Amino acid sequence: SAVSAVFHNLACRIAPDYALEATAKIIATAKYGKELLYKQTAISRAKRAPYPSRMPTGSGNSFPNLNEWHYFP
């Protein structure tokens, strides 16, 4: 996946070396390839936070149990 992303952006980076600026098709697809590889990373890091130091389980669960866990759950 990452092999087929990078060469669109490579075409952008070699353009200053050749003293020109890359066209609209190259720069847009280069950003699309940057986004694609990050889609899996973004979804993995899209997960809800662990609960703070104040958090009861109430009495609606079986037994009153322990209450006010830290960042354990």
Place this chain on the structure above:
Amino acid sequence: AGEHIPIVPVFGEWGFVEDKEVYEGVVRLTKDGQRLRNMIMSFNADIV
């Protein structure tokens, strides 16, 4: 010692389907609402 059944059950709301006793208390229909009230409550606890 009894010549009649010494066990006389008291019923609440009572009747028959057909040839079958059917009875319910006051807590039957509340099982629907109460579990539902808790679902909405417990979800919004996570947001807080």
